[PDB]
Amino acid sequence: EDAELLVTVRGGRLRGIRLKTPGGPVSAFLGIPFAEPPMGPRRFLPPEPKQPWSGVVDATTFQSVCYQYVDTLYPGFEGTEMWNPNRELSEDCLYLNVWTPYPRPTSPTPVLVWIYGGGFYSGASSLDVYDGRFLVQAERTVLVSMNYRVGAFGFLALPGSREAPGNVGLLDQRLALQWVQENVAAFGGDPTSVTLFGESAGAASVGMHLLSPPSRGLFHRAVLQSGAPNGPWATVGMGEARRRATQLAHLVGCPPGNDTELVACLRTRPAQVLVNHEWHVLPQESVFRFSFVPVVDGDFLSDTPEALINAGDFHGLQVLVGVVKDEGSYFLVYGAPGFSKDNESLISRAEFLAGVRVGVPQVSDLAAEAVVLHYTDWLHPEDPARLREALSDVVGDHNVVCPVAQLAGRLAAQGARVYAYVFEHRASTLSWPLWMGVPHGYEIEFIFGIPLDPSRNYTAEEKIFAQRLMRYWANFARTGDPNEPAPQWPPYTAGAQQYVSLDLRPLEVRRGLRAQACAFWNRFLPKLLSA
Amino acid sequence: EDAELLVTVRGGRLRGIRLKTPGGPVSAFLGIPFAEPPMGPRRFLPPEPKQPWSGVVDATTFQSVCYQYVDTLYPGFEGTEMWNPNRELSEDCLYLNVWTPYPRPTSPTPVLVWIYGGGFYSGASSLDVYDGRFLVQAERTVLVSMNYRVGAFGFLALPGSREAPGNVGLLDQRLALQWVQENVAAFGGDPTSVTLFGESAGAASVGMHLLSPPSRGLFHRAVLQSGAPNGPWATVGMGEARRRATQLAHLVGCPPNDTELVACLRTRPAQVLVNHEWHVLPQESVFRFSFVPVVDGDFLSDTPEALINAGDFHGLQVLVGVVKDEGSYFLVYGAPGFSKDNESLISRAEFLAGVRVGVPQVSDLAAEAVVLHYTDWLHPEDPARLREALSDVVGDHNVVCPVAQLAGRLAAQGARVYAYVFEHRASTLSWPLWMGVPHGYEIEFIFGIPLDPSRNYTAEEKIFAQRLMRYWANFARTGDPNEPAPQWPPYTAGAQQYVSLDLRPLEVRRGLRAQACAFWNRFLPKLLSA
């Protein structure tokens, strides 16, 4: 028996595997149970901690993907299949993974904890692009990632009720963070230096842990990649969540009233059946809206994330935030009129005006025209190419860039040191069409060092670029500064608004995360909706 | 005596005067009475045609200026005094002026009619900058200008009442226009070729004659320089007009019945009325005027905006334009932090205060949309950028975008439109350089004032003035400013082409602040409704 692959955590003993990487070996503990399986009577309930076990649990492979919708838009196409479950769908999915250097570190080492995205309805820690072996080998870091319940299984809420309190998917993440504090030292890891990093809904989750006091004590730095908790999609009100919880029950057949009788009927339904109706709940066919997301309940989140962002004191905290260059294009192929991955998507003006209401759903007619005013070039009001880029900017700015910018500015002004980036390299292996640019999510594979995988076909240049980005992230985890203690990465402040661009070229500093556009979304448009 | 200087019109005989020019003489007939003096019981009443006279009317000097406020803000400053009255004030002021070539033309000659501006509260046809001798010597048209009543005397309205129906200053202009049709031929004019041209409130007046059928059959072409009938300042509703008239009565000690109140105002000396007209404004503004044309269903059957969108304008040729910095002039009269004697480098708090002063409403959220569009959010506190931005706010809202909207609607409904931006700063300009090319400082080049050797213009500016007089007169003859050479293309709603007028040859450009004007003409209007 290899002593390096045997570790004792507070619940019992574990056996791991030695993963081969180009640089050398790393120790992986994949599929460690951290909660009791949330099934049967435990569906929709907060996670119960894993009861201790006798013997040795083999943590040698990724456990099941939490039950979730599978995207069928472009079957067999790499650009969509890379995000689809690469394990079996099961409600028994509350397992986490740990990567550590081989041999185990002598002194305590800082942790990265990955929270995957997927619109709070999908995602898994087992995806190839989340493979932790390259980061941990290259930077001698401990990487942890966990599965959390998505969809109705994680975020269906009948607020006030004990059976469907909502936000249990977030509590899954919290329990995993609690697990990291009690047990990461056994893997040679430092529980006093734990950096959350996540992407999209993962980034939004990271932010909600920043705004929830019981979670704040579990980590010390944050990285928010192409997402934020204050995005118009990341939360719902109690009333909205309740209306979506019972509408799901009705299309499912519940009841054939009491909140307990309602959810008890929901528990008798097979998991696939909830997934298949999940959607038909949204008040409007849109893009960038998701049926079951965290609920502003007064518990996990005492107020809305904006109220909390604005009222928070963030001294002693370090944050790394950023977006891709073309946050918007990925979502337009999924339902906006005139768009496909298989043509140039040169839309008409009528299609642009229609796409605006799909991309900015649930707003007054006056609000929609303000969007049309600011994003139309009135010297070329009908140029199809400009209309396509403009719609991409609309839903990209509204959903991602402007929420991230708003967060970064409040954090910087209120005592946190912020660091901002725009990821602008288009991978040589990208399967999406050229007009989509640098789409949402396609910096992840470079942060995890995927180009170092000999199985893949990235250029030698892209490999060096991943090694540089891995160093930035690890530098931030250790120091809270991505800079090497070489062009300097300046902190982001509300005034200067400095960020750097990430591509094959050296770091270049720029100012403003779409400052003109985001002034519309973060300053004016809220005051239009009140009045 | 000189037979060229004697002309007989319907009302009787007049005697003119020969005037000199560096290119030869021209004939002037200044101070021709075209209406009965609107005094005493005729105050606020529509003009009555001048009754025939016996004898010879002396038409050798300008007549009195209509009673108006006099600008006392920078006493003795050229840039100020050039617009102030240069003749004595009087309610006896309804006179017009005719300039013809010398000797008088034998064939019918195209006629230009000038309507001065001055916010509908001031102005005079006698001002040096409106001297017609150069235009008519160089281009051999007939030129006419009239005085019309301004302020309360021209536009005080008690709608419905007969004692103060409003818009009589516009009727003064119409009456003079009727006078031209009946009498311009006696000077060699062609009443079948009358081009209206005016600046600022005069341009808005021209536009209103475009939209009023009784005026429309009285001219053939129109030039609107830095003004529109659809400006947020050029018209007023019936209710707001009535409120302003009654407050002015209260301010002058009149109570408080339409008949009794007009009667009491008729007893007040004219200067008393002038001293208070500005105090009936509901706010502390720039670019808003107490007594302006009223939309009452008579002169204007509807709002100028409504009449523009409904109009068929085939067979109409219009010349429209603005100067480069329409807003800068108006900020030294009240925007916080501005002066002509400093660089006016304002702070954000001043810029924000200056937005409520430039765009008098809405009361709460509309102000927010303006500051959003006009802030550079990478440089939100740069004073130089804020000075320039508040100038754009005032200029766009009040002039540029009303012009752009009129031009687009007229073009898309059958009119041939020519658009210009005047971008030359005169070497003689007395205003500071941060004001650029201010509002009003294209006129002197249009009237060929640089040709006067007594002034201090350059050789390049004299050629520029001659080129401008040629464009305007070309348009008055043919509806096309182009010389029958880079070409001035018509302005269309899609291409939005215009030319820059400066010492360089014509340069074609697209868009009269297309982005800024989308906000003012498309979004903002909808915001108010909801």
Ligand SMILES: *[C@@H]1O[C@H](CO[C@@H]2O[C@@H](C)[C@@H](O)[C@@H](O)[C@@H]2O)[C@@H](O[C@@H]2O[C@H](CO)[C@@H](O)[C@H](O)[C@H]2NC(C)=O)[C@H](O)[C@H]1NC(C)=O
């Ligand atoms: C670009 O493609 C979109 C998407 O539809 C295509 O139609 C398929 C038959 C196939 O050829 C793929 O390229 C795409 O999936 C086009 O939008 C469609 O247009 C048709 C007719 O107007 C309509 O019936 C569909 O409903 C439309 N789909 C959507 C999502 O709007 C678009 O016209 C194409 N643009 C081009 C060719 O310039």
Ligand SMILES: NC(=O)c1cc[n+](COC[n+]2ccccc2/C=N/O)cc1
């Ligand atoms: N629960 C559902 O049925 C359901 C259906 C569709 N979507 C939206 O999915 C489309 N989509 C839209 C944008 C990006 C990705 C994807 C697909 N990801 O798997 C969410 C839930």
Ligand SMILES: NC(=O)c1cc[n+](COC[n+]2ccccc2/C=N/O)cc1
């Ligand atoms: N009666 C009025 O509305 C009114 C408005 C403004 N002013 C004075 O405004 C100053 N001003 C501002 C801009 C141009 C000229 C002048 C001055 N008049 O010659 C007088 C009367």
